[PDB]
Amino acid sequence: TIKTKNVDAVFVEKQKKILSFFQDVSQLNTDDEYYKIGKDYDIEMNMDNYTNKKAVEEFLKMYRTGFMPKNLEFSVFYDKMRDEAIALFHLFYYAKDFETFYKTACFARVHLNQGQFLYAFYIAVIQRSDCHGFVVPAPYEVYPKMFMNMEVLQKIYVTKMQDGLINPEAAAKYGIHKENDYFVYKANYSNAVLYNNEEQRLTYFTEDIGMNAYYYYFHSHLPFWWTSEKYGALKERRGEVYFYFYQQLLARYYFERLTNGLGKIPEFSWYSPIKTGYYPLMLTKFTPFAQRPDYYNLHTEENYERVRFLDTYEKTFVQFLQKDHFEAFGQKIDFHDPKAINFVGNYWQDNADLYGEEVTKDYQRSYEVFARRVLGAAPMPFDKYTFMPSAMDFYQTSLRDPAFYQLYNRIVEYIVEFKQYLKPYTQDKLYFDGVKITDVKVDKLTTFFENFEFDASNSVYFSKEEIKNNHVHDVKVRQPRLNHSPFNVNIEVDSNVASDAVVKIFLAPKYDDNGIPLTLEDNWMKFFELDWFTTKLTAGQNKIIRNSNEFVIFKEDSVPMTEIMKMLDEGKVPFDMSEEFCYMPKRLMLPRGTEGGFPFQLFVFVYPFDNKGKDLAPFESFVLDNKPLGFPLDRPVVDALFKVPNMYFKDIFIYHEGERFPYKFNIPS
Amino acid sequence: EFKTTPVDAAFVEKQKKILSLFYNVNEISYEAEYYKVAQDFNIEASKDCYTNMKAYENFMMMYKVGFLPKNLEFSIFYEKMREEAIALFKLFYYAKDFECFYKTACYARVYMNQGMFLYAYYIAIIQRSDTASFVLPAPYEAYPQYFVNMEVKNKMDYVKMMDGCLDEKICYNYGIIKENEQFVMYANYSNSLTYPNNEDRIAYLTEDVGLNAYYYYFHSHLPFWWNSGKYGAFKERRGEIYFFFYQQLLARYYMERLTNGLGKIPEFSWYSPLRTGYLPPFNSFYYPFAQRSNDYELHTEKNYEEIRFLDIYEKTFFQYLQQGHFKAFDKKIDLHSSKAVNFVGNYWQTNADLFEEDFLQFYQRSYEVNARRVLGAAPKPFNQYTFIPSALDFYQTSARDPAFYQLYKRIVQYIIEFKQYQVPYTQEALHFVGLKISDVKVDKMVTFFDHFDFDAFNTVYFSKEELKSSPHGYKVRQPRLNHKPFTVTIDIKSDVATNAVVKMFLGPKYDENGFPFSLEDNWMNFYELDWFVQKVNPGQSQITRSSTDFAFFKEDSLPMAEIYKLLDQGKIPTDMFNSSDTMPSRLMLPKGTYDGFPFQLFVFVYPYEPTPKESEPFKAVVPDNKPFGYPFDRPVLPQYFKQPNMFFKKVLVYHEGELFPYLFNIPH
Numbered sequence A: 001t002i003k004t005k006n007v008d009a010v011f012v013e014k015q016k017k018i019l020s021f022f023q024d025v026s027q028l029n030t031d032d033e034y035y036k037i038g039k040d041y042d043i044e045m046n047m048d049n050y051t052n053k054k055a056v057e058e059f060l061k062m063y064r065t066g067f068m069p070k071n072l073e074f075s076v077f078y079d080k081m082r083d084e085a086i087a088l089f090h091l092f093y094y095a096k097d098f099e100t101f102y103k104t105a106c107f108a109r110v111h112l113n114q115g116q117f118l119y120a121f122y123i124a125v126i127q128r129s130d131c132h133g134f135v136v137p138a139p140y141e142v143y144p145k146m147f148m149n150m151e152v153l154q155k156i157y158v159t160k161m162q163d164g165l166i167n168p169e170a171a172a173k174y175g176i177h178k179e180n181d182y183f184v185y186k187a188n189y190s191n192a193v194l195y196n197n198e199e200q201r202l203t204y205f206t207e208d209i210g211m212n213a214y215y216y217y218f219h220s221h222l223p224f225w226w227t228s229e230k231y232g233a234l235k236e237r238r239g240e241v242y243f244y245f246y247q248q249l250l251a252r253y254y255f256e257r258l259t260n261g262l263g264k265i266p267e268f269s270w271y272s273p274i275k276t277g278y279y280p281l282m283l284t285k286f287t288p289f290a291q292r293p294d295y296y297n298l299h300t301e302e303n304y305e306r307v308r309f310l311d312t313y314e315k316t317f318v319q320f321l322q323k324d325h326f327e328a329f330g331q332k333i334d335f336h337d338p339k340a341i342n343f344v345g346n347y348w349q350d351n352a353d354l355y356g357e358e359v360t361k362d363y364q365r366s367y368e369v370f371a372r373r374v375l376g377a378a379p380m381p382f383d384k385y386t387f388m389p390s391a392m393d394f395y396q397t398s399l400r401d402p403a404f405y406q407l408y409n410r411i412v413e414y415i416v417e418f419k420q421y422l423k424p425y426t427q428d429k430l431y432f433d434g435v436k437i438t439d440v441k442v443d444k445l446t447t448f449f450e451n452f453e454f455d456a457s458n459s460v461y462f463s464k465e466e467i468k469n470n471h472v473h474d475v476k477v478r479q480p481r482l483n484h485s486p487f488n489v490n491i492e493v494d495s496n497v498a499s500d501a502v503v504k505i506f507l508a509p510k511y512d513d514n515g516i517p518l519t520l521e522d523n524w525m526k527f528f529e530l531d532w533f534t535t536k537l538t539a540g541q542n543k544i545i546r547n548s549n550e551f552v553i554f555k556e557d558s559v560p561m562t563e564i565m566k567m568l569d570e571g572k573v574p575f576d577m578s579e580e581f582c583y584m585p586k587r588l589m590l591p592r593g594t595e596g597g598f599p600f601q602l603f604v605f606v607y608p609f610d611n612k613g614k615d616l617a618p619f620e621s622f623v624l625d626n627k628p629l630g631f632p633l634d635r636p637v638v639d640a641l642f643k644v645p646n647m648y649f650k651d652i653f654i655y656h657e658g659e660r661f662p663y664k665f666n667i668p669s
Numbered sequence B: 001e002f003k004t005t006p007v008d009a010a011f012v013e014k015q016k017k018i019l020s021l022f023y024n025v026n027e028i029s030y031e032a033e034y035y036k037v038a039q040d041f042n043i044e045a046s047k048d049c050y051t052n053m054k055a056y057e058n059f060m061m062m063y064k065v066g067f068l069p070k071n072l073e074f075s076i077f078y079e080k081m082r083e084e085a086i087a088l089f090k091l092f093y094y095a096k097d098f099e100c101f102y103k104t105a106c107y108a109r110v111y112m113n114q115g116m117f118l119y120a121y122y123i124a125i126i127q128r129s130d131t132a133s134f135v136l137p138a139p140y141e142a143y144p145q146y147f148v149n150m151e152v153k154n155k156m157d158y159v160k161m162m163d164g165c166l167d168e169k170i171c172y173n174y175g176i177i178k179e180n181e182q183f184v185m186y187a188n189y190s191n192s193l194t195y196p197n198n199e200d201r202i203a204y205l206t207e208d209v210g211l212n213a214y215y216y217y218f219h220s221h222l223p224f225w226w227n228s229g230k231y232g233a234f235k236e237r238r239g240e241i242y243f244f245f246y247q248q249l250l251a252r253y254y255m256e257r258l259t260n261g262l263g264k265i266p267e268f269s270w271y272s273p274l275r276t277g278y279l280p281p282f283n284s285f286y287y288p289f290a291q292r293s294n295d296y297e298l299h300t301e302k303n304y305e306e307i308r309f310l311d312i313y314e315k316t317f318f319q320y321l322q323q324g325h326f327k328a329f330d331k332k333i334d335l336h337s338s339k340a341v342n343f344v345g346n347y348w349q350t351n352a353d354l355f356e357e358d359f360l361q362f363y364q365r366s367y368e369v370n371a372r373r374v375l376g377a378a379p380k381p382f383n384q385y386t387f388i389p390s391a392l393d394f395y396q397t398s399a400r401d402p403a404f405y406q407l408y409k410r411i412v413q414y415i416i417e418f419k420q421y422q423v424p425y426t427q428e429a430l431h432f433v434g435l436k437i438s439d440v441k442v443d444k445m446v447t448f449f450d451h452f453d454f455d456a457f458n459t460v461y462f463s464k465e466e467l468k469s470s471p472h473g474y475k476v477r478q479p480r481l482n483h484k485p486f487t488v489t490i491d492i493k494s495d496v497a498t499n500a501v502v503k504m505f506l507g508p509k510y511d512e513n514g515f516p517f518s519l520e521d522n523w524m525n526f527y528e529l530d531w532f533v534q535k536v537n538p539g540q541s542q543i544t545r546s547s548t549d550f551a552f553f554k555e556d557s558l559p560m561a562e563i564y565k566l567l568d569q570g571k572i573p574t575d576m577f578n579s580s581d582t583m584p585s586r587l588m589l590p591k592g593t594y595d596g597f598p599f600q601l602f603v604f605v606y607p608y609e610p611t612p613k614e615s616e617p618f619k620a621v622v623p624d625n626k627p628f629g630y631p632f633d634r635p636v637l638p639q640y641f642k643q644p645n646m647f648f649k650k651v652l653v654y655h656e657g658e659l660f661p662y663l664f665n666i667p668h
């Protein structure tokens, strides 16, 4: 049951070519075609194959000075590395056509750093208009080192060195099985071996390979360092997207807190220690990730300069708030204008659009970059190419760190402060003339854990022979992930006059920790959007049914790249990998329930789909509306002036079936 | 290049069996001898393989329960693990004869946590009187994961997975080379990314494999949890040995500081942040080693309880000092005697002797153990068998962490406070009637770096096929400090004729000031180079003494591959046999300067009193009733160190070739 889609042999060929770059990523098959091309490809000679003369010359000047060497860890948060990554991005992006693009990537694969290559390649494929419709495999299949602890990795390594198992039945005791010609390794979350604070309750969520892969997709669809000029309409809305993404992510995460009895995301100070440490169990082929003990004093000698920066960055904003109206960055900004959200978001991401430029520049110091460094607790980089990575140097790992959520909670809250300048909507804007919701009904909402496997083959090094015969796909990791049963939502509406309408579905908490009901006044930002759609109303009474698996904001699991090869032989590609790349995985839609049924609420909004004066189709097939994202919960609400006949709040309860605890799935018997 | 000992046939058979347990420590060979003997070994029905019945049944009770599972990290600093290691050592030690000992060992090597086995097995060989003379692989060949920085370990792991070098020339540029069908990986000492501070100036001593082995050896020769009654008369001097060991070590270490522009070992407080952090490139295939940032607050919630403990343990000591005399642990102690020095050391080590018992008990808490847990920075163990490791969790990694020297500097100072109670040496106790040193001359003293190999095959996994041939050939190459041999010649005028003791010490000549050290504040900073007895003639004579002969320094360990070849010839290396627990020669001198770095050589001659006829736990125990470190075992009045039988000589320590070791590891 995988949503498919049919394709021609020209596609399959290009698609196989694109996919070839993701196989055995840390090595060279000097037999493969990609090698022959790559070895000899003369870039200077091919200058006429690029849309941009100077991007080629800028690159070639960079390349003659030398790029980041092989094997070292790449991260986009460091100046010289970013600039090489962008330089290579441009080269990919300005390739005349596919042929040129492909030969260019072959060169880059053979000669450049692999994390650098992959980072740029990945973005290029999402960005090149002639690649829209193509499929890239899951980031966890591409960087499996980033999506798994030391324990699994070492087992995998041990098995490769021995070239199999010395003892099938001793292997079984270690969660290592042979099925077919595959090695399957069971893997626990890190709390099964480490419980250093309460945040360890949530590792099935923060360590979820889907969630982390999600954040890397989000970054790749629009890098902070690149303008959004290519997405037209989205440009005047970039800041709003930035807010909305984090606001959503944090509501979802907060929900996981409530069901695990953990309450609000803690605030911190640049001048005080921060409470909760992180102790990464991840390995870099060159180094260990940095640890932040509990009660880490943010303000020590090595941070004095970085913290002076963060503080002014924040204070300048407090000053914008106090000023209401002001000229910043060559733009007059007014805080009572809701459109100022563009500037607000851009300011916090320090993205290229803040300056109205193509690419950010070194001297445009980023707040997020320096927060990540400060909170990362790493010692100072050794040189331009050599740093001590923390979870927060990578999009693939950021969600693993409790401090990640505290950082962006911080930024979101400051944005909420600005939101207080927006007038709350009146009756008039929210009221659907002659339309009323009479009931909403939901199927039982249940969560449960079920096993999930992925190809971890890139973490392993193969011999010259194995690379030839192409036995290079034999390592799978088995890990319990959260999931939920499909459920329906019945909306019963009355309308006297037939007309087109938008239906919106939101999920929210019902109580704080004291068990007092959520007022809207305080809690409008803790609402999580489940679904957007339209229907045709008729005079009288209608029943609208919508399945959880028709929900537009979520996708199915990626399929392993091995299965994509099987399918491409039939002329098929899985739909959700192609145009639903960067949505959250469906299985993580709901927070883990409790066995007695945890109290939430479901909010259902129905409003007229008038025309489509302005609709998002550029980056996201998202707001086909002139409506702010998260409409109507995009600004502070007044309980009294808010509720109208076309809104319905229904009390809902989230259950859980089978084992409550992931580790219970990895016990050998 | 090495001193050999002829060795008979019975010995070679036994030595070989012993060394064979150290092969491929990390997996099991279904076709090896040890495996078949382990399977044939009915532990149940062989109570009569053992001297001690209690020890036998004790182990059985425990074994019916279960021991630390295979693959996990072993550390003797965690209670349940220690109790299990001790039980297994009891078994090894009480084995009726060498046969039962071998079988037990095979048995343990198969069914038990390998780290726990190696620990117990090492110690057993050193302690069993029928094994006293046999040799052991260097600690870096048995536990190479504790002597290899992560970058190197990974380079090896990926070469194994690849089954060799894809392309010699990429490999070369990464410091990987083929030699006699063996892989050699070049290794740098860690950069500011490992010691994010000044302590990185010294990484070439603190990471040095000899120095770390040395510490492992000193522990195994007499473990804190054991009784010293096996060494009879030595038991009355156990605390003295404990002081001397750390005092010497810290004196040596401070000399390395001075030549790298570094000054005094910082002092610390349990209630304040510790300035100097440590980030180890080590992992236990489960957790990476715990990091300690710079300015890490020792007194945080998870340490409240342990600091309380460490704080009274210290203050109890102060109260001793204040009271002069008192009862403690049975005894009535008077700080004016030597039954005192011994007690003081034992106190600080919470060793078995302090309680007058055979083994440390479950509930007797150790200062050193909790000091190390607090300084080590690790989150609290997950359960009985699973802790997060730090450098201070192992004898073989301890010397790598700046905090280690700070911890022992603290203890040693407290002992120096006690030493103020000791009555100073007088003119008459130091003067050698009718003997005088007229001159001391010394050859050029020159340090330098050169390459050293060891086999790291023990942290590489092999297939069923490969194992059938017990495989090695994964060698690590590293620049290591070293010196050129030199001669000390002493000129002596004397009236009559006796045996003399000649002693040589090395001390600093100036502090970080540039100011001359006075003996009052320097006696603790001298480390012993040598000890020997001499027949003195009437009149004028010259004693010549080469560095290669210095009593307290050893040659390098040979790797097993070489040991095997020597054994094939009827030979073993003397130093691995007669003196493994001695510091290596190459580290005899601290790195000099091209310049020449100013130190002083102290030469002491005193009358020899033929005494003790013993059986030595360390080579630091020389057949003399004088204190260890005499005449620098205690506070000095500088005006008695002018006897004609003393000579202080200024020497300058030079250096040659490259000053920085990393220039020894650059590609083309």
Ligand SMILES: *[C@@H]1O[C@H](CO)[C@@H](O[C@@H]2O[C@H](CO)[C@@H](O[C@@H]3O[C@H](CO)[C@@H](O)[C@H](O[C@H]4O[C@H](CO)[C@@H](O)[C@H](O)[C@@H]4O[C@@H]4O[C@H](CO)[C@@H](O)[C@H](O)[C@@H]4O)[C@@H]3O)[C@H](O)[C@H]2NC(C)=O)[C@H](O)[C@H]1NC(C)=O
Residues within 6 Å of the ligand: A173, A174, A175, A186, A187, A188, A192, A193, A663, A664, A666, A667, A668, B065, B066, B067, B069, B070
């Ligand atoms: C993920 O995380 C979870 C939680 O941490 C892990 O779950 C743990 O899994 C352990 C197994 O690896 C399990 O331990 C076993 O418990 C059973 C039930 O009591 C015992 O039968 C086992 O004991 C055997 O092994 C011991 C040492 O390894 C021996 O001391 C002992 O002798 C025994 O061997 C057997 O007993 C006979 C002795 O008379 C012997 O003759 C016979 O031949 C047998 O071999 C284990 O102790 C944990 O209990 C379990 N934890 C929990 C809370 O359930 C999970 O493994 C992790 N998964 C992965 C994939 O990493």
Ligand SMILES: *[C@@H]1O[C@H](CO)[C@@H](O[C@@H]2O[C@H](CO)[C@@H](O[C@@H]3O[C@H](CO[C@H]4O[C@H](CO)[C@@H](O)[C@H](O)[C@@H]4O)[C@@H](O)[C@H](O[C@@H]4O[C@H](CO)[C@@H](O)[C@H](O)[C@@H]4O)[C@@H]3O)[C@H](O)[C@H]2NC(C)=O)[C@H](O)[C@H]1NC(C)=O
Residues within 6 Å of the ligand: A065, A066, A067, A068, A069, A070, B173, B174, B175, B186, B187, B188, B662, B663, B665, B666, B667
């Ligand atoms: C132990 O530690 C030492 C010191 O850190 C380390 O030595 C360093 O090694 C690297 C390579 O291994 C070496 O740099 C190579 O450097 C050479 C020399 O370049 C010289 O000349 C340049 C002008 O022509 C000048 O710009 C330089 O400053 C320098 O004086 C250079 O030829 C190499 O060039 C590059 O090759 C790489 C291939 O990966 C490409 O990525 C890149 O495009 C270039 O073509 C290369 O940079 C460096 O100089 C050494 N460092 C020092 C301080 O001397 C050891 O390698 C390390 N050993 C082990 C075994 O771990």
